[PDB]
Amino acid sequence: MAVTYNPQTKQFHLRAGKASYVMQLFRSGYLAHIYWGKAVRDVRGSRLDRAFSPNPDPSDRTFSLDTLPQEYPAYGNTDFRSPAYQVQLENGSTVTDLRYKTHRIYKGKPRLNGLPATYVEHEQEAETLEIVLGDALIGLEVTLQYTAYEKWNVITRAARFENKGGERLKLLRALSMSVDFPTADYDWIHLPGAWGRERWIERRPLVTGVQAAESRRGASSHQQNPFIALVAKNADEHQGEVYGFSFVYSGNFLAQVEVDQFHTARVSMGINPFDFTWLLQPGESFQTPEVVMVYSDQGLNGMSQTYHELYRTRLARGAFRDRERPILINNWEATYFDFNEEKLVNIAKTEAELGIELFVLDDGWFGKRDDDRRSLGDWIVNRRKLPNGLDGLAKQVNELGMQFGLWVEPEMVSPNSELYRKHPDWCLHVPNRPRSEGRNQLVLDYSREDVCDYIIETISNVLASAPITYVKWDMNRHMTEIGSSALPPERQRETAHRYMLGLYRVMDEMTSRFPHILFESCSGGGGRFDPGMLYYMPQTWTSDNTDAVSRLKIQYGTSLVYPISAMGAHVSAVPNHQVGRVASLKARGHVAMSGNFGYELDITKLTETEKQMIKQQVAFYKDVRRLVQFGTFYRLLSPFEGNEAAWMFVSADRSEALVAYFRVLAEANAPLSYLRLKGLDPNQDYEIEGLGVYGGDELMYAGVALPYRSGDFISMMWRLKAV
Amino acid sequence: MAVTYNPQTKQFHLRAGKASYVMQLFRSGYLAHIYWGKAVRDVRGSRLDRAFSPNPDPSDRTFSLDTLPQEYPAYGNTDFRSPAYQVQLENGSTVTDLRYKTHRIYKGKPRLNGLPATYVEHEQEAETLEIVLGDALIGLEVTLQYTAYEKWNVITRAARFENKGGERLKLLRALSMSVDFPTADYDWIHLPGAWGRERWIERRPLVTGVQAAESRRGASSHQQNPFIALVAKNADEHQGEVYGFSFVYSGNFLAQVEVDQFHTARVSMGINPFDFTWLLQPGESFQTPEVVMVYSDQGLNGMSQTYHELYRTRLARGAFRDRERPILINNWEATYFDFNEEKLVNIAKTEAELGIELFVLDDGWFGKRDDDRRSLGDWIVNRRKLPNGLDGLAKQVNELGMQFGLWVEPEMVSPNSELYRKHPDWCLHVPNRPRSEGRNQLVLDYSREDVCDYIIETISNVLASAPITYVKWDMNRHMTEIGSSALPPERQRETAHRYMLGLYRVMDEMTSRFPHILFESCSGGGGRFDPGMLYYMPQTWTSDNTDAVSRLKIQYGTSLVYPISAMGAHVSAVPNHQVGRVASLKARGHVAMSGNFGYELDITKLTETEKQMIKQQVAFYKDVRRLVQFGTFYRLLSPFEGNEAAWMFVSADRSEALVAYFRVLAEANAPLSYLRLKGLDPNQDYEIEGLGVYGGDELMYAGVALPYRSGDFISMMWRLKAV
Incomplete structure (x- = not known):
């Protein structure tokens, strides 16, 4: 929390929990990275002169930007390493020269415009430093935002750009942070995976060059989670230095370590610059999402425990933030799509008798939706299947003692839907190109206000129609042909990020409109299991793979960053599906009860002894749920x-x-x-x-x-x- | 050499030496990578359908571009992996959809417009396949160029873009090749280094994500050589599968391996897309440099031996290609700058008596050049220091039995030079920004015709003024503030590549104008030791570090790709300089005689017994020079x-x-x-x-x-x- 600036040494010292993060002003307004590690009382801020590292100041051949460790480096005026940002000017040049102008320190932690961010409940919990940089020639201002928490070893970082000049500035790259470590004697960890096998831990030595994890999918992805760490060579779960970098954002990302010729490690993270630009007209600004940086000398468990407490209590929000989460059962595989009201209620009595707390109604309750093919976007209750609507079903489920929940997938639209026929231009697309499909569906253009307003209206109409207290919000494909007919050519590459800003606005509105609803995010399982989504929906469906053995890896890796409170884990029926495995009901329970516990099966197919085990699992989990x-x-x-x-x-x-x-x-x-x-x-x-x-x-x-x-x-x- | 297309299977089979490289047309004109490895007679061209890998053809959900192995992949229409190229349209979209149109096969190997490339002396030596791809909507044509050599396991690849439409197309990325391996069970090797320690071999396991070596220096660089390899886990110097990728280019590069969620390895290489664009007006074309791809199952020595023979005999050119190279002595440290004509001649007699074959005159023969500060760009003989000009000195050196050589640094200009005062706009610069210096000098804008013509004129005036038969062409800094006042805003990011094209034109003209001159390229040692430079100058100064122990690593790594004929290695005097070491005259000889041998010392400081060792080293090297x-x-x-x-x-x-x-x-x-x-x-x-x-x-x-x-x-x- 305790953030200071020493005018004699020109050093910023951020004290967060038991960690120190230290920066220092250098020569004509350069901002140097000094130290990040176990807390010190002070640390004083060699050989910056190197062959082929040129000099930005001809009068001063003691340094290069190619060798100075920095907080927010640019390319083009002597640094040849990977830059944190890049801007193209009207004259086609990409050279920018930010120098320190001023700074301010204040108590607490600001909100970020349009974005999720870790927060405080009391000003005493953190202090924030804003360092204002500027390139006077072009009127580019960049404010580096830093927050240090009192209680945790947490530094958070973001950058805010503002065009204070009279010309257009095009941001080609706008990462959230960058830090130059003085050595590269670390392994890195990242979390690669795929659908059905998210977030495997991968630990590798660093190379002299670049190594990175990224997403180009418009979603944080199953393929790479937006988290990387540097860890001491000998560090393990219980001891040793670990530096974690977690991106609070749910779209495209880059998470990179570049090691240079002098074996210094530059770690950077932010919105993926690939296929991205952002146009700043005079007077316009751009706020990056934040990166949450955690230090521990108590190994990976020390780091994870910090993220768990921070994210559970100061990132997740809403009425259920600190509340035990219901043991739910999803009633899909009971019917796939094959449903109507008569079954559901008796099913609910059986489930209630077992002690299950929440009844969830899956896909195909709406429109003409009856395989992975139709009616997405038309969110009106198909009143054939449920003639008494959601209300009658829900109220009966409630009188049985269970809460009632629902599945929605609001970011998708079916080519065969009424929405698509009325507004085909409302999907992401590019002029004159085929519209590629994922599971027979297209992506709605959430960069558009009209689209977002329509979704808010339509989903609200459904959610306010019944005593619903849980919603699973699913998104089952990734973006192709990214563009918007509502943006000009010069802003087309803003589509993916504007989409995410739109989704964020929509989710913020929806969770505020329905404060009695526990929302769980989902994307073919854990395809957007990231801190950005956690700020809106306090739990996440971890993976579509519910195989007990497969889940050992998925849950172990997910727990590296994410609190168990957010980590959905359900007992499903066997033959398993993604894989093909047979493990005891006991065993699957054991793995799933190590997460946010629930069920995903057909109760109509269970033997008495099985239901009897389930009744016991439920009672058991209720007893240990607060602990888990x-x-x-x-x-x-x-x-x-x-x-x-x-x-x-x-x-x-x-x-x-x-x-x-x-x-x-x-x-x-x-x-x-x-x-x-x-x-x-x-x-x-x-x-x-x-x-x-x-x-x-x-x-x-x-x-x-x-x-x-x-x-x-x-x-x-x-x-x-x-x- | 033997390149075929089978119309029944739609398979291209390139047979190069004892290797096969196989591609196949797939569905509606997609081009798939099938195989690259030990020669097979035939190889027949699963599970392309994957969760979250979307379908480009809605009528065909059997595949995704995210899973199909490709030769030249794009991003945006279902592939989420790293693309080989990317184009932005006037409407701001970046979606392009190349499909196979046609192909041609012919004997021999074409020249590449404006560029170096491996070549043939007889058509029988190779065959070339051109596969024409096109995006009809936008009129983008891309011709994939492949050559297979008869005698060596060598496939060479490049791509040629042409705008056959009526709109502007901006190339954001134009790599020379891309290949999708079916597994990622390999280590990679690359050649990182720094000034004074180039091309250390670094072998690392692959990560699931991206790993890359690159240069942003406008020169291939000391920091990363443009070479990477994939090697079998158990492969070593003598056995095992190795795939080498060598970029025939001397400017910015990217060399990358990206491993995806299905553990396939995409290897790609070409001009670094960072800070690069290329504008194609209607009717305009862009030719990438080539990448030389070598396979061996005989370990790293097998691969290297292929590159050595190919590069020595079919990349290097000119009168000295197949000729033993002279034992030279550089007369710098005899005087630093401190020189005039009286010394030089007696020195030459001493050196001639020892059997040394070539006398080289270093820096400071020109203008007011007397520290690393002045007169660069003013290439007229300072006729104080040499009143009888170069001619009198040279002719005397010749009558002593030694050839005469000279140092030049034509890409640099001193702020304190007449050239700079007459044409300050002739340096690389951007409007209104400070002009950063490296060793007190600026970089000439070789993207400009007037600049290049001036250099050709000026250097020719010097070289034709004396019986010079060796020139060392040095470049001692990297590019900052990259831009040209002779390009419009929309082409500014072409500056670095146009610079290299300009240098190539200049070097081609200079080596053709002076066919009796052995040219050796240099860039603070081995800062541009790459196949692109080898095509123009058949040897290279390997490193400024001449320490015997340091050279063991530098020479060992350099030899991974480059023939010993090109690898300058000199005995220097001790106390060593970069490092600080004392090794026997015998020892330094042993290391240097394992390269292209020469001397770099002050002969006036030698003991009789030392000169006696040198006389013996010289006689010894003459005896083994052809072998080395x-x-x-x-x-x-x-x-x-x-x-x-x-x-x-x-x-x-x-x-x-x-x-x-x-x-x-x-x-x-x-x-x-x-x-x-x-x-x-x-x-x-x-x-x-x-x-x-x-x-x-x-x-x-x-x-x-x-x-x-x-x-x-x-x-x-x-x-x-x-x-």
């Missing part, structure tokens, strides 16, 4: 490192914990296995259900001797309680 | 893998070889060391000077027991001759 959704989460064993996965949840006072252990392909006649715990009070004794009493110190330093077992999938869960 | 410069080169031990370096040269008939061994920091009481040779006839016996007679089989399979030695730097060289 709000406790401190520790990863113990990594499925990316072998055949085991293990993790645990610990209460704030360390008096209670829940431990989960998994092993795949356990061999015959195998060595005994052990599990060392973390996060307990070493001087406290704990009762482990079914295993007796152990010292916290015994559990952490010697570990639990795991009951010997062998088989295709071992799954164990234990509750711990201080004696 | 034109023999087959094998790397044996890597200084990137430990404290040893070793390599050898073998004659074409395998009757003669030269072996060199080096070890740094050899410990006391160390294990015995051995060296296994390569490339000999196992059934032949060889005499090793000073070690007796050995079977070729013994030498390769059991190896040489190295004479035990210990010390800071061990250096050994042996001549082998078949008994």
Whole structure:
């Protein structure tokens, strides 16, 4: 929180939790990066003169922008490294020369225009530094925005551009931050994946050159999550230096590390410059989304725990932010599309009898929507299928003791829909080109006000028509032929970002209009599982893959950044679907109860003993839900490192914990296995259900001797309680 | 050489040496990459349908451009991977849709407009395939150019764009090639470095994401050489699959591997799209430089040996292409700038007595040039320092038995020069911005015809004024504030490439005007050591660092791509300069005689015994020069893998070889060391000077027991001759 500027040293010192982030003004208004790491009281701000690194000041051959470590570097006036931003002028030049002009420090944390951002509830929680840079010749101002939190090791960064000149300025690249580390002796971690296998942890040594994760899909994507980290060579889950970079944005991104000839590592992150430009007319401004930067010297768990608390309590919003989330059941595979009102209610009684709390109605309740082909965009209740509308169904579900929820997919329109026939120009498209389809549908142009107003109107008409208290908001394709008939040629490349701004406006309006609704975002599973979406909808469908073994990796990687409260995990029926696997009902429960728990099956196909297990799972999860959704989460064993996965949840006072252990392909006649715990009070004794009493110190330093077992999938869960 | 198209399968099969490269037409004119590897007689051209990979043809949901492996992919109509090219239309859209139109196959290999390229001397040496692609809507034609050599495992690739429509087309990205490998189970190799330490070999696993080497310096650079390779996980110097990609271009480049969600590896290479655009008015065309693609299953030595033969004999040109290169001495450090005619001649007699063949006159012979500060651009002989001009000095040097050579730096101009005062607009600059300097100098705008004509005129006036037979052409800074007052705003970003085209025109004219001159390119050492420069000047100054130990790495890495004939290596005096090291005259000779050999010292400071060693080194190198410069080169031990370096040269008939061994920091009481040779006839016996007679089989399979030695730097060289 404690942000200072020392006029003698011209140094900015941002103290965030137990971390320091230090910058310093250098020569004629350059802004240098000095340090970011464990908190220091002070740090004083060599060899900037290097062969083939040229001199911006002919009178001063002591430095180059090619060697000075910076906060917001440009290319073209002596730095040859990857720039944080680039601007093209009317004369075609791309040379810009920002210098420090002034700064201000204030308590609290500002909102970002049109954008999600971490926030504070009290000014005392953080302090913000704004450093105003300017290129006087062209009238370009860039304000670097920094916030340091008191309680957490969190620095947040963004940049705001403003054209204070009399000419057009075209932003070709506008990243949210850039930081030059003094060495490149780190591994990097990022989170690549695909549909059905999101956010695998990938750790790699750095190369001398560039390495990056990005999305060009108009959505943050299944393929790369907008998160990267630099980690010390020897750092692991429990110890060591880790620097995380998390982009609070749900569209295209670039997350990059470039290592230069002097083995310094430039980390940068922001809206993907690929296929992007932004035109600033005189007087216009551009605000980047923010990047949330976390430091820990307590390994990956230390970093994750920071993100979890920050994101759960100061990014997610609304009535359910700090509330236990309902155990839900999705009633899709009960019917695919095949539905009408008579079934649904008895089904709801069966589900209610098992203790399930929320009944969700899936796709095909609307219009002529009856495969992945039709009526998207026409959001009126198909009053054949539900003649009594949503109201009659919902109210009965409520009188059964369950909440009622609904699926929507408002960003899509079917070529065969009334909306498309009335307004074909309302989809993203480019002149004279075929309109490529994903799952037989097109993308609505949310860069347009009329489109957004129409969606707000139409979805509100549905949501206010029944006592709905949960909505799953799905988006099931990525953008092609990106353009808008409502933008001029010179702004066409703003389409993807304006689309996201439009979606953000729409979601902000929808969640405000319906404060009693828990919204869960979805994009073919976890295709937009990012901090930007979390600001609008406090939980997310983690993956369409609900296979127990597959979920071990998906949940483990997702937890690197995202709080368990946001991480949807459901028990589904087997034969599994994406993969093909058979694991016990017990086992799938064990994996799913390690997330935000729910069900995704046909209850009409269950044996009494199965429903009986489900009744027990539900009762069990209710007992540990506060611990799972709000406790401190520790990863113990990594499925990316072998055949085991293990993790645990610990209460704030360390008096209670829940431990989960998994092993795949356990061999015959195998060595005994052990599990060392973390996060307990070493001087406290704990009762482990079914295993007796152990010292916290015994559990952490010697570990639990795991009951010997062998088989295709071992799954164990234990509750711990201080004696 | 043997290039075919099968109309039944719609498959193109390029047979180059012992390699196959196969492509196939797919659906409505898409061009797919099928295979590249060891030669096959035939190869027949799954799961292109993938979640979130959308369909370009709504009637055909069997594929996506996001999954089809391609030769020249675009972004925007269903491929979300890194595109090979991108074009912006007047309407601001960037969507383009090239489809196959036609193709032609012919014998031989074309020249590339304005550009260097590998060539043939007889049509039988290669065959060329041109595949014509087109986007009918916009009138964009792209011809993919492929050449397959008969004798070598070499495919060369480039693309030629042409606007056959009636609107402006802006190329935002125009890479020379792109290839989608079916897996990413490879390491990559690239050649990062810095001034004084060029082309270190860096081998890294691939990441799921992008990794790239690039230059933004307007020159290929010391920092990254324009070469990358994919290599099998277990491949080494002697065995295993290797795919090399070498860019025949001396300016900005990007060399990239992007691995997608399905673990396919897209390798692409060409002019760096960063800060680049190219405007095509109707009727205009753009030719990319070529990329030379080499396959070997005989490890890195197999690949390198291909590049060496191809580049030495079918890229380098001129009278000296196949000629032994002179042992030269540079007379700089004899005087720094401090010179006049009286010294030079006696010096030349001393040097001639030692057997040195070429006398070179360094910087400061011209104008008011007397530190790294002045008179650059004013290329008239300072007739104080040399009152009898270059002619009198040269002719005397010739009567002493030595050739005479000269240093020039024609791309630079000093702010304090007459040229700059008459034409300040002739430097690269942007309107109203400071002109950043590198070594007190500015860069001439070679994108301008008047500038280029002036240089051709001025340098020719000097070169025709004396019997000069060697020129070192140096360039000692990189481009900043890139722009031209002779281009309109809409073409400003063409400046860097037009500059390089200008330099190429200038060098082509200069080497043609002076066919008796051996030209050696230089850029603060090996700052533009690339195949583009080799086409104009058949050798290159490898590095300004002449330290023996440092050169082990520099020469080892340079040899990965470049023939030893091109690799300048000189013995210099110690205390070494860049580093600070003391190695024996013997040792420095050993490292330098493993390249294109020469001297860089003050002969006036040598002891009789030293000159006596030099006289012996010179005689020795003359004896092995043909073997070193034109023999087959094998790397044996890597200084990137430990404290040893070793390599050898073998004659074409395998009757003669030269072996060199080096070890740094050899410990006391160390294990015995051995060296296994390569490339000999196992059934032949060889005499090793000073070690007796050995079977070729013994030498390769059991190896040489190295004479035990210990010390800071061990250096050994042996001549082998078949008994």
